[PDB]
């Protein structure tokens, strides 16, 4: 009953789902093979052969960040059908992977959603880590919310969203692809928590003692 399904859109989405799932695998002991060397049933579907399958959603439009995790150190654990990405990267564009091709792949992502969540009873909520500033985790995340608002009913969804703060801006189109997804997430979200890459910076400076970190 306590099961939660994660959704992770964007290159940022998959590489911040990866470290979080590493912490998930360390908090109750499961090897990167996915075997034993109530905490298990919420994220890991127990098999008839002792295997554990993470019931997440990892969706992208650039294969070069999701191709790594199917050839990395955790490629034994993650189900191959769930690690969805695309052929063309949206590239700071709302409409390609929403109208032309992401219209075609939201079909298969929703099929994977239906196939994953059918064996559950207690779907308690959804978790979405979307990209305001990016192209994939803006447009495809928006299409996911438009379909999920009307097909799943009044199910709780939560946003641990990222938000390009006005001081440090990686790309320049953060007022250009995030505003429409803000309009989308106003009416199609229940709780949305913003993070930024400036507050983590100075707590790592003074409160932590690590200089020159990565996003990892």
């Amino acid at each position: 009953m306590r099961e939660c399904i994660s959704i992770h859109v964007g290159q940022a989405g998959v590489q911040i789902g990866n470290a979080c799932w590493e912490l998930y695998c360390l908090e109750h002991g499961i090897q990167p093979d996915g075997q034993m060397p109530d905490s298990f049933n919420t994220f890991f579907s127990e098999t008839g052969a002792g295997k554990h399958v993470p019931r997440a959603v990892f969706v992208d439009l650039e294969p070069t960040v999701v191709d790594e995790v199917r050839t990395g150190t955790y490629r034994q654990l993650f189900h191959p059908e769930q690690l969805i990405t695309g052929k063309e990267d949206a590239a700071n564009n709302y409409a390609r992977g929403h109208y032309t091709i992401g219209k075609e792949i939201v079909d298969l992502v929703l099929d994977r959603i239906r196939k994953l969540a059918d064996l559950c009873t207690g779907l308690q909520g959804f978790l979405i880590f979307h990209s305001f500033g990016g192209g994939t985790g803006s447009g495809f995340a928006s299409l996911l919310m438009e379909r999920l608002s009307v097909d799943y009913g009044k199910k709780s969804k939560l946003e641990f969203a990222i938000y390009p703060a006005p001081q440090v801006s990686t790309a320049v189109v953060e007022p250009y692809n995030s505003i429409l997804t803000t309009h989308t997430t106003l009416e199609h979200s229940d709780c949305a928590f913003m993070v930024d890459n400036e507050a983590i910076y100075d707590i790592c400076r003074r409160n932590l003692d690590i200089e020159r970190p990565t996003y990892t």
Binding site: P63, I84, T85, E104, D107, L110, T121, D151
Partner: protein
């Protein structure tokens, strides 16, 4: 007195099997399919060096 309420039912969340799939998006994306078009014969013109 008369005894139990029998009760029944479950929850279910997703919209059943009511979503089509034929997008040829092979997990990581729509992979391949090459499309060759018929071409023509390259030619040129003539000249007159002498006769």
């Amino acid at each position: 007195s008369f005894r139990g309420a029998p009760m029944l039912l479950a929850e279910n969340c997703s919209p059943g099997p009511r979503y089509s799939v034929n997008p040829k998006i092979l997990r990581t994306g729509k992979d391949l399919g090459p499309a060759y078009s018929i071409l023509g014969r390259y030619h040129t013109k003539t000249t007159l060096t002498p006769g």
